[PDB]
Amino acid sequence: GIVEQCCTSICSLYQLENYCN
Amino acid sequence: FVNQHLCGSHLVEALYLVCGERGFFYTPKA
Numbered sequence: 001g002i003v004e005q006c007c008t009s010i011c012s013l014y015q016l017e018n019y020c021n
Numbered sequence: 022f023v024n025q026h027l028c029g030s031h032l033v034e035a036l037y038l039v040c041g042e043r044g045f046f047y048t049p050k051a
Binding site: 003008017021 | 024026027029035036048051
């Protein structure tokens, strides 16, 4: 999930946008 | 502000700034 991709590991704009509506 | 470890309120803040008027969904348990 998002915590695994952005918190535990380094985040990226590509991944963050996957969570926008 | 996006390319680092973002947790808790710090992650929520990033989603807020990036998504803008589109909004977003935050799911810690996924």
